Amino acid sequence: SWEVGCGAPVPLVKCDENSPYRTITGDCNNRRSPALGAANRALARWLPAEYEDGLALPFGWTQRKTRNGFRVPLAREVSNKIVGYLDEEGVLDQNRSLLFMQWGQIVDHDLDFAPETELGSNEHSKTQCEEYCIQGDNCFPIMFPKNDPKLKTQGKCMPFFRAGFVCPTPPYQSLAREQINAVTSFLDASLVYGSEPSLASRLRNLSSPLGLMAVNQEAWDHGLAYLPFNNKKPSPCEFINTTARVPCFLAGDFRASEQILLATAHTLLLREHNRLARELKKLNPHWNGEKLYQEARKILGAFIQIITFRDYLPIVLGSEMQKWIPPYQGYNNSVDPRISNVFTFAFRFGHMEVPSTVSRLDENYQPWGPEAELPLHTLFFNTWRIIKDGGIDPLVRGLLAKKSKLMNQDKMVTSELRNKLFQPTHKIHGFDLAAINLQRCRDHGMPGYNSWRGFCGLSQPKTLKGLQTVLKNKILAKKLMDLYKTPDNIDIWIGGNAEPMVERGRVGPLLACLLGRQFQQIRDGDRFWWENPGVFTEKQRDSLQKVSFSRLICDNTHITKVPLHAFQANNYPHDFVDCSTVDKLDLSPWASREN
Template sequence: MSDWLEARLFRAAGNLIDGWAWLSGEASAAVIGKAVGSTRNRPHPWSSFSDYTCWQGLTDRSYLARHLPPVDVPVQPDPERVRALFARPDGEAQISRKSTCLFPAFAQYLTDGFLRTVPGQVDRTTSNHEIDLCTLYGRTPAQTRALRLKSEEAGRRGLLKSRMDGAEEFPPFLYATGTKALSDPEFAILDAPLVDEALPQAQLDTLFAIGGDRANSTPFTAMMNTLFLREHNRIARHLQTLHPDWNDERVFQVARNIVIVLFIKIVVEHYINHITPMPFSLRADPSVAWHAEWNRPNWMTVEFSLLYRWHALMPDAIAWPTGDIPLRGFIANNAPLLAVGLDAAFSAAASQPAAKLGARNTAAALLHIEDRAVLQARTNRLAPYNAYRVAFGMEPARDFSEISSNPQIAATLQDLYGDPDHVEFYPGLMAEDRVKDSPLPGLLLRMVAVDAFSQALTNPLLSEHVWNEATFTPWGFDLIKRTSKLGDVLARNVPHRGPTPVEMTQADWRYGDPDGPVA
């Protein structure tokens, strides 16, 4: 059978499944169950607290959990040598056939909310271990209070602080213009933005006061936060009209419930559906997790905090309505977003192809972060790559060609490690061939699926006795059901929505037309 015909039949089967609500639900549940069931369920017996199982390691979530116990990896080449595995050999990005830049933009915003290692203490975390939009609402109740408007006036109840720039609503600025003084004394409780201390004042002036210390990292992450701030305030204003007797606190809390679940739906039905090679759409059906064996309290792992280092997805320059912006100029600078507005920013992200994820494709501006990832894995004494293949139901690689079909990558791995069993977790993860019809390599795809489903669908707001109209109001419950993509939210929150589809998948991509093996 030709590849063309196979792809057509594959997609036809997917369309058939999507066309039947019952069949779609069953297929989605089967895929999710199989994905999560590929490895051990939580709780994990190990954490970054100690080399052995102990009470604090099982209960203190300021440490990261571990899929596998720590080991001393026998071969650890100098990071400068390992860097050759990641660098773009000719300085030119290999461009993805499937993904747009909206994909890495959303991935970064999502993971910055719960993958939070402490600088200088890579075994520790400040994560809440939930998909809770702490990038918008803050990690702690005190941070949330600082970000809220806190008004009992009609039309202002339940709102987050914001500022208007013409017809556009943005978060307030963190600093008073031209100074390093906070624009609002309450913002002192927020996590300081993780930016270069020598950042020019002109860029400091553009940083927003928001819940996440990483949400100012690029205009892409800032636009995500701006979108969900607008959606929260839009929902809060509408709840006030439906329930004029509600006070500020209740309006805020119900709006927050709705927005968090909207976000989780987008995680599954937009983001994960872009990642999966399945020809039918997976559904964010909370009931899948209600009685599942894998429904356990969330706890982020050391491995999960490393496998999401998807720097290779970023091209060397960002195509922006005002002109191309080199990658270095796109960091910690919200001026490009403020210059064009929210709709144009999303359209730019959805119009530009992302780069391919994998070896030999990280931009020079981000190579130093690859060095840190290699060292972080070593500090946490992660088991070798092959051990994780086995732990997630895959056969170990016995030859370097089984990791990558690219002879240059296989040769680099052999030169660095000598034996497939010595390949370190992070380099091996990124060196693998990508899965057909997915932007991700094989082991990475499997590990993302385990954590994504088992930690998104176990959110307390999706639990059996909380998932109802009493929690979200009938109007809010209906809004959740009608939302599955970022474009749904954007259309509700921009003055005039442009014609560019807000998609993570390129418009002309078809099944059977994948990125192919790592080049």
């Protein structure tokens, strides 16, 4: 029976089973099935994988082979015709701060990561893909359609490498290709701590018995910590400004430096871990480093769980929140905690919530110097603008005082992401996230729009008129039909995001159902869910109920004025209160007296 079992390293351990702490890897959470939700395993399949050849070849591989008797449109064609827009005026979400966008990416990165196949480490395979646009093996290039401006300027294609599967060879006992989740399916702050023991240890301060995470020794933010530098070379962050030569940050997550506001959030969380560890050292001076690390790690985890379920999901799911995530009825070990392949595409709704600029604000929330507002694309893999240009406080103020972009059927993804994306492997602000998203859908063997509509119990539009009624939009339906010919072939990422938003929410019905069910499962199937009896004391839970992102900022920056509800659109000064008004995390319930 050939077992194409290769993917990546699965550390292997015997489960403690009576540890009050999560493993780094996510192993041992489910006692009956200790690998369930652990990193470096196949994403769960809610529907069977759909491949050109039933095994591995994505739809669009063989220019000839159809999907239900239709050619699939070029990913860049779909992007150009549907996803692009010119006018950034009027596009901002009037009731979501920029923090709404940024928290989404944080939650996402905690939950799932499907890394591109390596093998191209000091490689000519890279060259044959980038330089020659040659399809084969893991090179699945994004070809430019006719009349594409990038044809005139960049070449024939954007290079694209297929997601890591149960790893580099394609021959088995005949099974469909399954993409790997490199991070823990649990909402467990894995993007801070790592999902791999070796990295998790390297991130820690083992020089002192104080359970701290390692902090940068070369640079400080007016006394406050930065992440360490990643000193792996070559550095994409060094490359975007070779004068400054400021490398990417080293974090529990490989993607931490992808853009400056994600770098910022990673900084906030690390600071909070050290603050937590110092407070617990005061309360319990007998606690050793391991105990301090795990107990701070455990609080920070529940903090992420609480902000996500109390503050974030309701303003994503709106009317559908209670349908998919009713009140918690305790841990259910029969619930699958693993993130689904399809969820990794559903949650990419965030790409339509990213605006075209980022602002640095001063202490009166006014523009910070002459270059306050920057084009998004200049901030991809940009750490020098933090280290060499004001630290994180100006960007945090921007997160509070500026707005997420609203998803718009006529204005889906900003050109900053749709034309000017920088990839860490490559040299150009020339990539298309929307085209990459659609290519990746096919790479991952995604069933089509109507397959998922069916999965979610929703009508399956079969005609122009049907799609016009689902989408409440005649031109979008038409452009969609001209490209895809049947709604059956519409790739899940554009399909789900095309649908108008549910009442009081920021996604359509299909996405709500998909995200709703996934978030129900990561709660109910998590043995270390913060509300699971025995994980915290009743009193520790009473303390935890009072956490807010506003407090996190108050406690880990020199910002003294914050809004009470950090996710809604807030203007300074009317919506901003002094930090002394904000509920604190009372840690007195973590005091441990042997007497």
